[PDB]
Amino acid sequence: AGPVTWVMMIACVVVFIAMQILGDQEVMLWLAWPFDPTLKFEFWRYFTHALMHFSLMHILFNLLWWWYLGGAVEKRLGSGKLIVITLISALLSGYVQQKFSGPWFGGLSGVVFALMGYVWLRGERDPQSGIYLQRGLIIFALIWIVAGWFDMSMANGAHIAGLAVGLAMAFVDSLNA
Amino acid sequence: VRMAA
């Protein structure tokens, strides 16, 4: 089942609903990464960027990946583990996307790229954890990054920063194991 | 705007 898996899928749907009623821009003004240093103390923004989606294929594609991989981490390593991966990856993939291309980005695939990174590496270095990423998916993941380099209009810094975060954490966690 | 993706 997974409480931290469902809470995030419900948050993303609640916020998507609001973007349909109020328009994208109206939600963006309030949930996006701070665009002005004066707003730096609006702490929610460092995380809230991750809840915003721009089409139905955007949310569905993301929530599917979140369910498959997020649910697997939560099931085997617990709710606390998936919380910490989510918070650290959302903050850092946000920070890198803002530097690459400014603050107008949104979506969960920064968290998703860190999950792909964590589940793959953790499954190779600590097979006993009981999670893993299939080879057929580590290829789709890699095609997905590079298809963003050569363009749609993806947040490329989010993708690469997320991936990096998730490898790092999976490495650290495959020492302590 | 850029999608995370």
PDB file of C-alpha atoms in Angstrom:
ATOM      1  CA  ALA A   1       0.000   0.000   0.000  1.00  0.00           C
ATOM      2  CA  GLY A   2       2.248   2.763   1.340  1.00  0.00           C
ATOM      3  CA  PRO A   3       1.161   5.936   3.214  1.00  0.00           C
ATOM      4  CA  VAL A   4       3.973   8.175   1.946  1.00  0.00           C
ATOM      5  CA  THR A   5       3.427   6.846  -1.626  1.00  0.00           C
ATOM      6  CA  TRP A   6      -0.320   7.688  -1.672  1.00  0.00           C
ATOM      7  CA  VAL A   7      -0.049  11.062   0.171  1.00  0.00           C
ATOM      8  CA  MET A   8       2.257  12.339  -2.587  1.00  0.00           C
ATOM      9  CA  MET A   9       0.018  11.040  -5.374  1.00  0.00           C
ATOM     10  CA  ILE A  10      -2.918  12.817  -3.732  1.00  0.00           C
ATOM     11  CA  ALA A  11      -0.969  16.054  -3.233  1.00  0.00           C
ATOM     12  CA  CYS A  12       0.019  16.030  -6.934  1.00  0.00           C
ATOM     13  CA  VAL A  13      -3.590  15.474  -8.010  1.00  0.00           C
ATOM     14  CA  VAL A  14      -4.990  18.149  -5.641  1.00  0.00           C
ATOM     15  CA  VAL A  15      -2.462  20.699  -7.004  1.00  0.00           C
ATOM     16  CA  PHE A  16      -3.092  19.624 -10.629  1.00  0.00           C
ATOM     17  CA  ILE A  17      -6.838  20.187 -10.049  1.00  0.00           C
ATOM     18  CA  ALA A  18      -6.112  23.733  -8.817  1.00  0.00           C
ATOM     19  CA  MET A  19      -3.981  24.439 -11.931  1.00  0.00           C
ATOM     20  CA  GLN A  20      -7.013  23.583 -14.081  1.00  0.00           C
ATOM     21  CA  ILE A  21      -9.367  25.819 -12.123  1.00  0.00           C
ATOM     22  CA  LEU A  22      -7.036  28.789 -11.571  1.00  0.00           C
ATOM     23  CA  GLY A  23      -4.698  28.342 -14.571  1.00  0.00           C
ATOM     24  CA  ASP A  24      -1.042  27.244 -14.521  1.00  0.00           C
ATOM     25  CA  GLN A  25       0.408  30.734 -14.016  1.00  0.00           C
ATOM     26  CA  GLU A  26      -1.711  31.492 -10.937  1.00  0.00           C
ATOM     27  CA  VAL A  27      -0.472  28.345  -9.171  1.00  0.00           C
ATOM     28  CA  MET A  28       3.067  28.926 -10.429  1.00  0.00           C
ATOM     29  CA  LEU A  29       3.242  32.374  -8.797  1.00  0.00           C
ATOM     30  CA  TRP A  30       2.696  30.725  -5.384  1.00  0.00           C
ATOM     31  CA  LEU A  31       4.393  27.295  -5.628  1.00  0.00           C
ATOM     32  CA  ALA A  32       7.431  27.891  -7.890  1.00  0.00           C
ATOM     33  CA  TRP A  33      11.050  28.234  -6.730  1.00  0.00           C
ATOM     34  CA  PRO A  34      11.547  31.882  -5.514  1.00  0.00           C
ATOM     35  CA  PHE A  35      12.150  34.165  -8.526  1.00  0.00           C
ATOM     36  CA  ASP A  36      13.100  37.122  -6.346  1.00  0.00           C
ATOM     37  CA  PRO A  37      15.601  37.062  -3.406  1.00  0.00           C
ATOM     38  CA  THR A  38      13.022  38.973  -1.345  1.00  0.00           C
ATOM     39  CA  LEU A  39      10.842  35.807  -1.363  1.00  0.00           C
ATOM     40  CA  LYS A  40      13.684  33.573  -0.125  1.00  0.00           C
ATOM     41  CA  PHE A  41      11.975  33.114   3.243  1.00  0.00           C
ATOM     42  CA  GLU A  42       8.915  31.464   1.680  1.00  0.00           C
ATOM     43  CA  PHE A  43      10.278  28.009   2.602  1.00  0.00           C
ATOM     44  CA  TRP A  44       7.514  25.902   0.986  1.00  0.00           C
ATOM     45  CA  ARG A  45       8.646  26.914  -2.523  1.00  0.00           C
ATOM     46  CA  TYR A  46      11.898  24.903  -2.242  1.00  0.00           C
ATOM     47  CA  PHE A  47       9.713  21.766  -2.246  1.00  0.00           C
ATOM     48  CA  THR A  48       6.359  22.808  -3.777  1.00  0.00           C
ATOM     49  CA  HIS A  49       7.775  23.052  -7.323  1.00  0.00           C
ATOM     50  CA  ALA A  50       7.684  19.224  -7.302  1.00  0.00           C
ATOM     51  CA  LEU A  51       3.839  19.035  -7.085  1.00  0.00           C
ATOM     52  CA  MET A  52       3.127  21.076 -10.207  1.00  0.00           C
ATOM     53  CA  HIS A  53       2.353  19.322 -13.539  1.00  0.00           C
ATOM     54  CA  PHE A  54       1.640  20.874 -16.946  1.00  0.00           C
ATOM     55  CA  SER A  55      -0.327  18.237 -18.837  1.00  0.00           C
ATOM     56  CA  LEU A  56      -2.226  15.044 -18.076  1.00  0.00           C
ATOM     57  CA  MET A  57       0.510  12.961 -19.705  1.00  0.00           C
ATOM     58  CA  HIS A  58       2.967  14.880 -17.489  1.00  0.00           C
ATOM     59  CA  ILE A  59       1.246  13.923 -14.206  1.00  0.00           C
ATOM     60  CA  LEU A  60       0.340  10.384 -15.287  1.00  0.00           C
ATOM     61  CA  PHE A  61       3.814   9.576 -16.570  1.00  0.00           C
ATOM     62  CA  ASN A  62       5.356  10.916 -13.337  1.00  0.00           C
ATOM     63  CA  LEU A  63       2.889   9.395 -10.832  1.00  0.00           C
ATOM     64  CA  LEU A  64       3.358   5.973 -12.488  1.00  0.00           C
ATOM     65  CA  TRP A  65       7.145   6.098 -12.003  1.00  0.00           C
ATOM     66  CA  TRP A  66       6.559   7.472  -8.487  1.00  0.00           C
ATOM     67  CA  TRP A  67       4.205   4.608  -7.673  1.00  0.00           C
ATOM     68  CA  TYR A  68       6.424   1.822  -9.059  1.00  0.00           C
ATOM     69  CA  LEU A  69       9.717   3.032  -7.519  1.00  0.00           C
ATOM     70  CA  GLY A  70       8.519   5.099  -4.536  1.00  0.00           C
ATOM     71  CA  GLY A  71       6.218   2.266  -3.422  1.00  0.00           C
ATOM     72  CA  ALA A  72       9.124  -0.173  -3.633  1.00  0.00           C
ATOM     73  CA  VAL A  73      11.418   1.944  -1.428  1.00  0.00           C
ATOM     74  CA  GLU A  74       8.650   2.497   1.118  1.00  0.00           C
ATOM     75  CA  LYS A  75       7.655  -1.188   1.166  1.00  0.00           C
ATOM     76  CA  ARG A  76      11.208  -2.468   1.827  1.00  0.00           C
ATOM     77  CA  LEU A  77      13.081   0.372   3.581  1.00  0.00           C
ATOM     78  CA  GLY A  78      10.226   2.200   5.251  1.00  0.00           C
ATOM     79  CA  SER A  79       8.292   5.492   5.118  1.00  0.00           C
ATOM     80  CA  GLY A  80      11.138   7.464   6.733  1.00  0.00           C
ATOM     81  CA  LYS A  81      13.531   6.489   3.948  1.00  0.00           C
ATOM     82  CA  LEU A  82      11.189   7.645   1.189  1.00  0.00           C
ATOM     83  CA  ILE A  83      10.516  10.926   3.028  1.00  0.00           C
ATOM     84  CA  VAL A  84      14.238  11.686   3.277  1.00  0.00           C
ATOM     85  CA  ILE A  85      15.015  10.776  -0.357  1.00  0.00           C
ATOM     86  CA  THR A  86      12.039  12.936  -1.470  1.00  0.00           C
ATOM     87  CA  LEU A  87      12.939  16.058   0.589  1.00  0.00           C
ATOM     88  CA  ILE A  88      16.674  16.056  -0.216  1.00  0.00           C
ATOM     89  CA  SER A  89      16.193  15.291  -3.916  1.00  0.00           C
ATOM     90  CA  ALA A  90      13.368  17.830  -4.390  1.00  0.00           C
ATOM     91  CA  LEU A  91      15.405  20.621  -2.770  1.00  0.00           C
ATOM     92  CA  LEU A  92      18.663  19.852  -4.653  1.00  0.00           C
ATOM     93  CA  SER A  93      17.141  19.110  -8.095  1.00  0.00           C
ATOM     94  CA  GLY A  94      15.255  22.375  -7.660  1.00  0.00           C
ATOM     95  CA  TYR A  95      18.439  24.263  -6.797  1.00  0.00           C
ATOM     96  CA  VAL A  96      20.271  22.978  -9.853  1.00  0.00           C
ATOM     97  CA  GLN A  97      17.362  23.543 -12.266  1.00  0.00           C
ATOM     98  CA  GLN A  98      17.050  27.137 -11.059  1.00  0.00           C
ATOM     99  CA  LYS A  99      20.726  27.813 -11.879  1.00  0.00           C
ATOM    100  CA  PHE A 100      20.599  26.132 -15.315  1.00  0.00           C
ATOM    101  CA  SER A 101      17.413  27.739 -16.609  1.00  0.00           C
ATOM    102  CA  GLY A 102      15.842  29.972 -13.939  1.00  0.00           C
ATOM    103  CA  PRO A 103      12.865  29.288 -11.594  1.00  0.00           C
ATOM    104  CA  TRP A 104       9.974  28.448 -13.978  1.00  0.00           C
ATOM    105  CA  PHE A 105       9.951  24.627 -13.808  1.00  0.00           C
ATOM    106  CA  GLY A 106       7.730  22.000 -12.119  1.00  0.00           C
ATOM    107  CA  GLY A 107       7.051  18.272 -11.814  1.00  0.00           C
ATOM    108  CA  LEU A 108       8.087  15.220  -9.849  1.00  0.00           C
ATOM    109  CA  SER A 109      10.728  13.754 -12.194  1.00  0.00           C
ATOM    110  CA  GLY A 110      13.551  15.278 -10.170  1.00  0.00           C
ATOM    111  CA  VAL A 111      12.458  13.133  -7.250  1.00  0.00           C
ATOM    112  CA  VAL A 112      11.842  10.339  -9.837  1.00  0.00           C
ATOM    113  CA  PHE A 113      15.389  10.534 -11.248  1.00  0.00           C
ATOM    114  CA  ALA A 114      16.788  10.279  -7.701  1.00  0.00           C
ATOM    115  CA  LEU A 115      14.561   7.223  -7.109  1.00  0.00           C
ATOM    116  CA  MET A 116      15.785   5.594 -10.359  1.00  0.00           C
ATOM    117  CA  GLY A 117      19.377   6.259  -9.201  1.00  0.00           C
ATOM    118  CA  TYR A 118      18.818   4.957  -5.642  1.00  0.00           C
ATOM    119  CA  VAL A 119      16.868   1.818  -6.609  1.00  0.00           C
ATOM    120  CA  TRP A 120      19.410   0.836  -9.304  1.00  0.00           C
ATOM    121  CA  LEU A 121      22.625   1.369  -7.258  1.00  0.00           C
ATOM    122  CA  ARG A 122      21.150   0.019  -4.004  1.00  0.00           C
ATOM    123  CA  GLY A 123      20.068  -3.139  -5.890  1.00  0.00           C
ATOM    124  CA  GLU A 124      23.621  -3.668  -7.193  1.00  0.00           C
ATOM    125  CA  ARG A 125      25.597  -2.981  -4.023  1.00  0.00           C
ATOM    126  CA  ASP A 126      23.111  -4.278  -1.450  1.00  0.00           C
ATOM    127  CA  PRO A 127      20.902  -6.829  -3.319  1.00  0.00           C
ATOM    128  CA  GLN A 128      19.529  -7.976   0.056  1.00  0.00           C
ATOM    129  CA  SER A 129      17.628  -4.681   0.516  1.00  0.00           C
ATOM    130  CA  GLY A 130      15.024  -6.242  -1.777  1.00  0.00           C
ATOM    131  CA  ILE A 131      14.753  -3.416  -4.335  1.00  0.00           C
ATOM    132  CA  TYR A 132      16.247  -3.268  -7.851  1.00  0.00           C
ATOM    133  CA  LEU A 133      15.891  -1.593 -11.268  1.00  0.00           C
ATOM    134  CA  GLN A 134      15.657  -3.881 -14.313  1.00  0.00           C
ATOM    135  CA  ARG A 135      18.115  -3.385 -17.197  1.00  0.00           C
ATOM    136  CA  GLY A 136      15.212  -2.602 -19.544  1.00  0.00           C
ATOM    137  CA  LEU A 137      14.408   0.409 -17.337  1.00  0.00           C
ATOM    138  CA  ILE A 138      17.953   1.696 -16.784  1.00  0.00           C
ATOM    139  CA  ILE A 139      18.004   1.967 -20.590  1.00  0.00           C
ATOM    140  CA  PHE A 140      14.696   3.854 -20.780  1.00  0.00           C
ATOM    141  CA  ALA A 141      15.961   6.140 -17.994  1.00  0.00           C
ATOM    142  CA  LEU A 142      19.197   6.920 -19.896  1.00  0.00           C
ATOM    143  CA  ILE A 143      17.395   7.511 -23.223  1.00  0.00           C
ATOM    144  CA  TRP A 144      15.063   9.831 -21.264  1.00  0.00           C
ATOM    145  CA  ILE A 145      17.939  12.022 -19.960  1.00  0.00           C
ATOM    146  CA  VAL A 146      19.644  12.348 -23.367  1.00  0.00           C
ATOM    147  CA  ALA A 147      16.351  12.969 -25.219  1.00  0.00           C
ATOM    148  CA  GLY A 148      16.077  16.021 -22.961  1.00  0.00           C
ATOM    149  CA  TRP A 149      19.504  17.279 -24.049  1.00  0.00           C
ATOM    150  CA  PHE A 150      18.316  17.235 -27.675  1.00  0.00           C
ATOM    151  CA  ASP A 151      14.777  18.367 -26.951  1.00  0.00           C
ATOM    152  CA  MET A 152       9.854  18.856 -25.832  1.00  0.00           C
ATOM    153  CA  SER A 153      11.353  21.098 -23.126  1.00  0.00           C
ATOM    154  CA  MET A 154      12.578  19.179 -20.091  1.00  0.00           C
ATOM    155  CA  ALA A 155      14.221  20.429 -16.887  1.00  0.00           C
ATOM    156  CA  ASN A 156      17.651  18.963 -17.619  1.00  0.00           C
ATOM    157  CA  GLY A 157      19.360  20.202 -14.438  1.00  0.00           C
ATOM    158  CA  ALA A 158      16.615  18.613 -12.313  1.00  0.00           C
ATOM    159  CA  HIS A 159      17.145  15.255 -14.110  1.00  0.00           C
ATOM    160  CA  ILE A 160      20.954  15.209 -13.708  1.00  0.00           C
ATOM    161  CA  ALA A 161      20.959  16.615 -10.179  1.00  0.00           C
ATOM    162  CA  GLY A 162      18.291  14.137  -9.046  1.00  0.00           C
ATOM    163  CA  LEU A 163      20.122  11.145 -10.527  1.00  0.00           C
ATOM    164  CA  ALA A 164      23.305  12.271  -8.760  1.00  0.00           C
ATOM    165  CA  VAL A 165      21.630  12.700  -5.359  1.00  0.00           C
ATOM    166  CA  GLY A 166      20.108   9.206  -5.544  1.00  0.00           C
ATOM    167  CA  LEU A 167      23.339   7.485  -6.538  1.00  0.00           C
ATOM    168  CA  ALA A 168      25.179   9.258  -3.661  1.00  0.00           C
ATOM    169  CA  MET A 169      22.572   8.283  -1.050  1.00  0.00           C
ATOM    170  CA  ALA A 170      22.358   4.670  -2.295  1.00  0.00           C
ATOM    171  CA  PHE A 171      26.171   4.512  -2.082  1.00  0.00           C
ATOM    172  CA  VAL A 172      26.260   5.884   1.509  1.00  0.00           C
ATOM    173  CA  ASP A 173      23.425   3.473   2.492  1.00  0.00           C
ATOM    174  CA  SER A 174      25.347   0.552   0.924  1.00  0.00           C
ATOM    175  CA  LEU A 175      28.171   1.078   3.388  1.00  0.00           C
ATOM    176  CA  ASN A 176      26.018   1.328   6.540  1.00  0.00           C
ATOM    177  CA  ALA A 177      24.261  -1.920   5.441  1.00  0.00           C
TER     178      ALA A 177
ATOM    179  CA  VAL B   1       8.708  26.649 -18.573  1.00  0.00           C
ATOM    180  CA  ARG B   2      10.475  23.313 -18.285  1.00  0.00           C
ATOM    181  CA  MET B   3       8.898  20.066 -17.242  1.00  0.00           C
ATOM    182  CA  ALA B   4      10.592  17.450 -14.786  1.00  0.00           C
ATOM    183  CA  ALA B   5       9.418  15.615 -17.510  1.00  0.00           C
TER     184      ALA B   5
END
